[PDB]
Description:
antiviral defense; RNA-binding; 4-stranded antiparallel β-sheet; 9-stranded mixed β-sheet; CRISPR-assoc_Csm5; RNA binding
Amino acid sequence: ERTLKVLSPLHIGTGNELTPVDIYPRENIIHVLDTERLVNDLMNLGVELNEILALLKNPPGDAYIWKGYIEEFHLDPSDYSIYTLKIHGKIGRKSMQIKEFIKLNGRPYIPGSSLKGAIRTAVLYKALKECGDARAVMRVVSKVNGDVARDIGRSEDVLDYYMSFLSDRKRADDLLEAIVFGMEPDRRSKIRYEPKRDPMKALIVRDSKPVGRKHLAVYHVEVIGNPQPIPIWVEAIEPGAATDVEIHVDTEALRLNADYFNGLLWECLKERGEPGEVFEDFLWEAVDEFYTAVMKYETIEVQKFGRYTSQVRSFYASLEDHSGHVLRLGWGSGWLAMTIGLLLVEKGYKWENVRRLADGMPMGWVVL
């Protein structure tokens, strides 16, 4: 199991949120309460359940929910804490609402899909950057659907083909994932992504071992490009926390499906030698090229919105002083569209024609 180290605050979320019913703040600690034991103790102190239920139905307009009881009955909040979160950023006025960080049996971890998705996004970038010419992509697609391969082909690079096709995003996005990462003909849908034909099947990324909850904290989150009246709060692993991950290339799968893989990525390995030996090398080169380009334009973007502080320039310089592979986790549904956009900017289009700070700091950076 390779070692993994969190470099900048890292939120990977179920989508579920802690509510003020779940927390008691005091000073710069959020207590994540055991509400059940707190309700049972209050009822043995003679609070009748009706009063508790009415408080949950109609939370007060100025204080929290459990501030009234914890501070009326002189309770110790630590006696009811499951765990605690140090606060990073401007505290919420009255109600704080926190994106929970994904757990198994109470213990945070990095899912393998998060790590593999950051790798997959970088592999897309190298494949399109190096083998995205009309000739190579047409050779790939002509063996599956010659109408698509003919349509792509009179549109210069595949970058321009993606952009003419958009000019209906989810279609282009799925069409491009199939061309790069493997494809089956389909009668209702001229091309479809096939996982069975994807070289990334050969890369095995297990979920990490658990991180201790002591490395969870809560971070105020800002967006440079979007203004939201409601403050955003996330559980995130603190920088410098470390765990281990099982990650390795399934060489047996790679030799075994060697005739069954297709798509631009397997073509691009084939141009470089025997595809199954190039694979792990191309993969980690792609992680290095891509997230170099990511941090360069993340830097330009954070300084375009005036948030580029002495801590932040020091942070991005620190990313360059590591010997392992540096990645930014947390890719959503627009991961192909974002990667097309970096490639369009690298060829010299303005981003205006073609992101989040946790307490001022860029999110999601890790090193393996």
